[PDB]
Design a protein around this nucleic acid. Structure first.
Lengths: 50, 246, 73, 105, 72, 90
RNA sequence: UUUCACUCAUUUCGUUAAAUGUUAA
RNA sequence: AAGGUUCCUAAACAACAUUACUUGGAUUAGGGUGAAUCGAUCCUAAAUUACAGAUGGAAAUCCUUAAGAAAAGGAUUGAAAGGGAAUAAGAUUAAUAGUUCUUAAUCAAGAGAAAUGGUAACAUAUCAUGAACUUUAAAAUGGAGUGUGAAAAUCUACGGAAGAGUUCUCUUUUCUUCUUAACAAAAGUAAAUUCCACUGAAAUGAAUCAAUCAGAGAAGUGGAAUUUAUUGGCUUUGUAAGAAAUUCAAUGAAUUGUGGUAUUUUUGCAGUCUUCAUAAAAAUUAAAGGGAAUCUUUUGCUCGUACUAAUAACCGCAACAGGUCUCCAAGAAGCAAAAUCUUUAGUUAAAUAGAAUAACGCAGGUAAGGGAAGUCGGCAACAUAGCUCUGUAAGUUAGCAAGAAAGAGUAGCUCUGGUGAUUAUCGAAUCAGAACUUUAAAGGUUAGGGGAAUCCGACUGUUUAAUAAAAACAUAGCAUUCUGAUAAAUCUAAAAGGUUCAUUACAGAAUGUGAUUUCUGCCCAGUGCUCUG
RNA sequence: GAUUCACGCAGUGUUAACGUGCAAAUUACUUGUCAUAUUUGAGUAUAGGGGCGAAAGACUCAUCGAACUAUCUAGUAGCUGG
């Protein structure tokens, strides 16, 4: 909604912050298997349910 | 089976009273010395319509006889009261319509209303529209007087029980035939949830004891003992008689 | 905004110490003396040039005077 | 015709959500928030709308000048002129009758 | 119309985020949390819900202070 | 205009001849003006069930549901007056 | 044991626990 | 509301949008949400929840001011649609704006023996003292229908200024612009209602579309007050032309009258009708009765604010023909917010196309002569269809049937007449009539098939979400039973517990039949119920 | 709680379309209805032998002649399959 509580808005912003991929430098580490973030979601694919 | 509609009525769900626009509790004022051994005077400021009841309510205003201010009361109108009328409440009050007198001071044959079953309990009997109770006799030996209730039953009360002399306003309300189901719908605007009543024989055996089979009928006598449990007590209870009266 | 009706008020207004700024607007048919005070913007519609020049001598010299014409500043 | 939009976030034709469409520079129309219609004062006895007092909101009476929120008379804001003449006659006549009937009849 | 058509008006939340357990289980009208049993002082745990015990209990979190004490 | 159905022609033809007859007497008496006991004017009109207001006189009177004064409410007033006089005299 | 009389537990009420009872004037 | 970055821009097209995509609500990286005045925050509604108390083996339940050494009087929560102190116009960004900028305002909290006028209704840039206590009013109150004041939109009359379109056939022509805020002022001037003074009405008058009113005083004359989207309603004024719009020149120049006895919308006002319906409370504000006491300036904190709001941003597994509450609303024609076409705005893509033009299909059609012979059955389709005038039966609860049935008229053009205002000028769509012409006229679109009977339900209404919409349920009406409130019905394990009940027999609870008319016959053995025994 | 049209709404008929659908109940025409027993948003109350029901055993999250979910529980099976 346009209207939201302060605490709810911050939890909205964190969900935005956590929707990012692996940085390239982290992918070059020795013995690295973390290439893709499997916790990712998109607004039209899965609803975060909050 | 299920719990019948009479069982569901005692739970205080949607069957609660629709009393939001009501004016308030209509009763006499609290007893005191000035009512026991004097007369207080009240002024009928206005006559109002209390939703859900057939009689008008008078917004009587008294004066505080021990402190400074007003005692805004709420009486049930006796027929003939008008705005600006003075009404006197006490043991020495005159026998006029609208005055509040202890039932011992009324002569035998007096027509009263809003009588107290017990002294100081602020009105019990004869409160519907056009109703009244007559004084039958006095008994100064035990300070009790006999009155005749609107149902015809005779009741003996204490001689100091208060009452309002006269007839409750709004008489003849139920003689006008409702013509439409819509009109009956508006009748219960400020009442409980009861109106559209489905016949038990139209129900199913789970819902009601009358819930019938291939023909709409009852099957068993509809006159039942008083001791029947809630759930099977449906129909006529402790019926001393049945059929059309002669 | 308030309007000053005759000449006596505006001079007393000008000599009063609550003034802040003065802007003079020259229209095709009149001249308006908008005195910018602390609270309101008093104006005086004038049509006689001689009375306007009298008014123009009445403004204290320290006050910033704005001259407004067909081109806004 | 120019069609308009609600300026505030209320979107229902509620009593407090009254709007007026007025014209502005260039032919554009803007939306104003108009004020509810209030009632005046009534005589404490006869319930008649008193003359000489405006019908505005309760708080705006505080902004009005001291003389514009009442009438210069006995009870002057709570009773009509008729409501007061009855009060004066009742006080004088009843006291006079209480003076002759009792109190050295 | 008990299927596709009836789901058009589902735009009123029943449960919102709780404050003690952090899950979307705070019933608004009931004013209680269905998971951690908020208002209630004791955390809501049932012996028939053996899995719900292992999902949130001691040792499933940071153990900020207890880890020092037990090692002590 | 109408032969006999005067005020109950608004009910059309859908409530029964007898019921439309009974409701006619009540609806005429409920909507008529009565003589106002304090100023003797035909100015009393009903405002609610049991509340009557003198239009040109500024009085509110409690009365019957549809008539200003009921038959039972008039005999009771007469009876009390007889009782009060008898009590006041010995 | 039954029929009585009282109130003191007990019930049902009312108020701002606002003149109850008995003398006195 | 719900979604949550989907918003804007740039790079890029591996995957996804039933072909493709240089496009994207898709990938990657940045940017973006500014409030003293809008909301939340404050108040209370239905309702909700605490300490103590009561109840329970227990978990816990009840009570919400009654039980309390608690709280002048009663605790917590409960509305982004109820109540509520105070802001507008223009400009600005790739994106935010009653929030930023310019200009112009408002509000709250602070700082620097006590007044006149008017006969009266009542009136005076702060003025002109007014405590405790009490009262009144406001906040704060249904709906329908009719009349009308004002504003806006559309249409139109007179006079124009600027630009644009048409022009070998005409057209002094057709089209666009000509505007103005919050807050205040008071040149001029309205409608309606209520009061005041003089006077005293009959030969009764005054008035409305309707009403309605008068010796508790009409009509008349003269006054006072309130309402009419901020001050004071409209024109007008300040703000304010310096803005904005339309042109012109290459930043600078021009104009920005006055009206309408027309339609719609909005917002008020006045009475009328209707209810066995009477259609919220508090925070907060003002006044009154009483007489105790003796202009300048500062500050205005916390949170929301981007975007969609749907034939692609919400819910249905999705870019699903399903579902989802609102605000603003042009022309034609018409009774009509109908069907059909168009202007401002939006879009030409919304699960791919090209060629051929077989059968059988889905959607829309027509048809000679006959006209239901088809079929369980006129199922489907055909047919009637607007308005005016004439005419209209049996039956009936006398209200209806009834738009019964049935018949005639209707176009175009040129004319004629009726219905008013101001005192000759001005104006309104509406009705009636007459010559002439033709392809003989409601029909492009929208647009009743009708009649004679029988059965059931009296009627309006409701019903098996997803095979039953009905004769079933409800209904008003009729009838029966119990109960005097410490009761009847009835919820709970218990309870100073709960519901009808803010109630009191014209009431509360439990049942059967189902409007009206006419009538409800005999039976108390059997089983119930009851007895004042 | 009169007769009709419109915005809307329902679901009488075609027992039309579709029936591995646009759709786990929708589409087209036809029909009915379209303000007072009216339509509708939010808040609020009622919960499992319970609620709610103008009454169809109807509705109570695609689940109702007794919801959903977990434990007893690998319930028992003279019956069927391997």
């Amino acid at each position: 909604t346009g209207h939201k509580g302060f605490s709810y808005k911050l939890k909205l912003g964190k969900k935005i912050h956590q929707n990012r991929g692996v940085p390239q430098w982290f992918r070059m580490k020795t013995g690295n298997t973390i290439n893709y973030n499997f916790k990712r979601r998109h607004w039209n694919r899965r609803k975060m349910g909050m | 089976g299920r719990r019948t509609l009479s069982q569901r009525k005692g739970r205080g769900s949607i069957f609660k009273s629709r009393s939001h626009h009501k004016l308030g509790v209509a009763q006499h004022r609290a007893i005191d010395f000035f009512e026991r051994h004097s007369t207080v005077r009240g002024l009928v400021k206005s006559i109002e319509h209390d939703p859900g009841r057939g009689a008008p309510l008078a917004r009587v205003v008294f004066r505080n006889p021990r402190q400074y201010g007003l005692d805004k009361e709420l009486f049930i109108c006796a027929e003939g009261l008008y705005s600006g009328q003075y009404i006197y409440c006490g043991s020495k009050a005159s026998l006029h319509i609208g005055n509040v007198l202890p039932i011992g001071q009324c002569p035998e044959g007096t027509v009263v209303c809003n009588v107290e079953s017990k002294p100081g309990d602020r009105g019990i009997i004869a409160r519907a529209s056009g109703n009244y109770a007559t004084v039958i006799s006095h008994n100064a030996d035990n300070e009790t007087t006999r009155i005749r209730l609107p149902s015809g039953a005779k009741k003996t009360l204490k001689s100091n029980c208060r009452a309002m002399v006269g007839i409750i306003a709004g008489g003849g309300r139920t003689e006008k035939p409702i013509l439409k189901a819509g009109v009956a719908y508006r009748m219960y605007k400020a009442k409980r949830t009861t109106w559209p009543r489905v016949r038990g024989v139209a129900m199913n055996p789970v819902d009601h004891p009358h819930g019938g089979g291939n023909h709409q009928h009852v099957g068993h006598p509809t006159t039942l003992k008083r001791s029947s449990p809630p759930g099977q007590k449906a129909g006529k209870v402790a019926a001393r008689r049945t059929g059309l009266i002669r | 905004p308030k309007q000053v009706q005759e000449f006596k008020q505006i001079l007393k207004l000008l000599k009063s110490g609550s003034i802040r700024a003065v802007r003079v607007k020259t229209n095709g048919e009149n001249t308006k003396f908008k005195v910018r005070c602390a609270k309101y913007l008093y104006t005086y519609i004038c049509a006689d040039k001689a009375k306007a020049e009298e008014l123009k001598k009445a403004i204290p010299k320290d006050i910033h005077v704005v001259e407004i014409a067909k081109k806004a500043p | 015709a120019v069609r308009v939009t609600y300026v505030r976030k209320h979107s229902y034709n509620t009593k407090s959500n009254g709007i007026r469409i007025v014209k502005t520079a260039g032919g554009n129309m803007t939306v104003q928030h108009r004020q509810k219609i209030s009632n005046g004062v009534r005589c404490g006895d006869c319930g008649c709308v008193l003359a000489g007092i405006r019908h505005i909101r309760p708080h705006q009476y505080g902004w009005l000048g001291k003389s514009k929120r009442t009438v210069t008379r006995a009870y002057g804001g709570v009773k009509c002129h008729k409501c007061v003449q009855k009060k004066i006659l009742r006080a004088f006549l009843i006291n006079e009758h209480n003076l002759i009937k009792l109190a050295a009849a | 119309t008990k299927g596709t058509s009836c789901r058009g008006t589902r735009h009123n939340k029943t449960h919102i985020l709780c404050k003690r357990c952090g899950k979307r289980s705070w019933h608004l009208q009931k004013q209680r949390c269905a998971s951690c049993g908020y208002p209630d002082a004791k955390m809501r745990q049932y012996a028939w819900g053996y899995k719900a015990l292992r999902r949130r209990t001691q040792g499933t979190g940071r153990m900020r202070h207890l880890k020092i004490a037990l090692k002590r | 205009r109408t032969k006999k159905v005067g005020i109950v022609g608004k009910y059309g033809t859908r409530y029964g001849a007898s019921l439309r007859k009974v409701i006619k007497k009540i609806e005429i008496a409920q909507h008529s003006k009565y003589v106002c006991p304090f100023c003797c004017k035909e100015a009393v009109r009903r405002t609610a069930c049991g509340i009557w207001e003198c239009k040109g006189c500024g009085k509110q009177i409690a009365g019957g549901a549809y008539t200003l004064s009921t038959i039972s409410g008039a005999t009771v007033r007469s009876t009390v007056r007889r009782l009060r006089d008898a009590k006041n005299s010995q």
